[PDB]
Amino acid sequence: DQLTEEQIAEFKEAFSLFDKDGDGTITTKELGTVMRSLGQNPTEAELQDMINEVDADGNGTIDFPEFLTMMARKMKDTDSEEEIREAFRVFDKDGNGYISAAELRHVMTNLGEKLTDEEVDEMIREADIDGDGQVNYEEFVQMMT
Amino acid sequence: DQLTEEQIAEFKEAFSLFDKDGDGTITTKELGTVMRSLGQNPTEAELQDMINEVDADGNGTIDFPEFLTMMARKMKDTDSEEEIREAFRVFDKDGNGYISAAELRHVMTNLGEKLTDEEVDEMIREADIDGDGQVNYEEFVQMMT
Numbered sequence: 701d702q703l704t705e706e707q708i709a710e711f712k713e714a715f716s717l718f719d720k721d722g723d724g725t726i727t728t729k730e731l732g733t734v735m736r737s738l739g740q741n742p743t744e745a746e747l748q749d750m751i752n753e754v755d756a757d758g759n760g761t762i763d764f765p766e767f768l769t770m771m772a773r774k775m776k777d778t779d780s781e782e783e784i785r786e787a788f789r790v791f792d793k794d795g796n797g798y799i800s801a802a803e804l805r806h807v808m809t810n811l812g813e814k815l816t817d818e819e820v821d822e823m824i825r826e827a828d829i830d831g832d833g834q835v836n837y838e839e840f841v842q843m844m845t
Numbered sequence: 846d847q848l849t850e851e852q853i854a855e856f857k858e859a860f861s862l863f864d865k866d867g868d869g870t871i872t873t874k875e876l877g878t879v880m881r882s883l884g885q886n887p888t889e890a891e892l893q894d895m896i897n898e899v900d901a902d903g904n905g906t907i908d909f910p911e912f913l914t915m916m917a918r919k920m921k922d923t924d925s926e927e928e929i930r931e932a933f934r935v936f937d938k939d940g941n942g943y944i945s946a947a948e949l950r951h952v953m954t955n956l957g958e959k960l961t962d963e964e965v966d967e968m969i970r971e972a973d974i975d976g977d978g979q980v981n982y983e984e985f986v987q988m989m990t
Contacts, residue, residue, distance in 0.1 A: 717950070737947035739955050784989055787956030788982040790948045793938045798979045801863070801969050802881035803935045808965045810884050811932035812957045820953050824946045833947040837933035840949075845926045 703772045711771050714738050715764050717821055718833065725761045733833035734767075739783030814844065848917050856916050859883050860909050862966055863978065869909040876907055878978030884928030885919075959989065 703711075714737045719726045726734060728751045735742050742750070754766045791799035791807075827839040848856075863879045864871045871879065873896050880887050887895075899911040936944035960968075968988050974980040 714950070718946075733945075733947045735947075736945070737950045739951050781986065781990055783951075783955060784959065785982075785986045787952045788985055790945075790952050791935065792982065797981060797983070799982050800878070800881070801972070801974050801978045801980045802878045804980075804985075805859075805862075805882045805965055805969065806884050806928075807932050807935050807952065808957055808960070809962045810928060812953060813962075814929070815953065817954050817958065820950055824950065827946075829946050830943070833945050834943045835946045835949070836942055837930075837937060837944050838942065840933055841926060841929050844929050 701776075703768075703775055707775065708768065711738070711768055712764065713821065715767060717824060718829070719764075720829075724764045726767075727760050728755075728762065729831055730833075731762055731767075736786075736833070739786050740778065741786060846921060848913075848920065852920065853913065855883065856913055857909065858966070860912055862969060863974075865974070870904075870906045871908075871912075872906055872976070874976045874978070876912070879912075881931075881978070884931050885923055886931055 714734050715726065717737065718730050718734050728747070731750060732742065732747050735747070750770060751760075751762065754762050754770060788799060788804075791803055823840050823843055824835070826843065827835050829835050859879050859882050860869070860871065863875045863882065865875075873892055876895065877887060877889075877892050880892075895915050896905060896907055898915070899908075900906050933944060933949075934940075936949055968985050969980070971988060972980050972984045
């Protein structure tokens, strides 16, 4: 029991999405963002380990292969419940455990309708992402209108 | 200018959604969350006025007929980009104008692929949601589980 074709393609999609060089490597800083864009946010420590097992050679970079292999060995102990909870956490501002039913709806049904699973990828590529994955949303609005 | 049938149908789906009771009548807050669930955050004077306009008999509620009448007068002054802007603002937790690309991708492609429009509506109905449209997200996580 390994990673299906879809999973692989998912990891490949997230990695490439935050790998501006277009080559096949990403800094340790971008690793955290790649993970979060996958639904699992690692602790500063968990990420640290990952960077070591891969490029503990202080080079700071990570190759898609070394990353894919790493993702497979850890994709064993990973329940779908974690990823979903992270998705809802995005709506929790104060972190108090609650979210607005309205925002949830408006984001899932409205904005989800106006955007295809492939337009989000492109908009992020075209837009200029921060070194922490942070983006100025007016760019998404400007390109959607 | 008249409202399309798709419009009318949304205003009706949202109205009944947050009308926990069953009587085509909702409170001032329920109104606010209904309209936010449609992509249009209304001002607190704006809401008060939509209620003081109709329910000027003490109750402090509003029914679908008048709701739709106002929405018709309201929609004639609202556009599409402002609904997009509000969906992205959902991501800017601190209101600095920036959001996490990682987070945006995750809830739009991952979470948004694990459920449909009716599921979101179905889940919102089965979930305990207080007067502010606020809901404990652990519920949604469990419903999906």
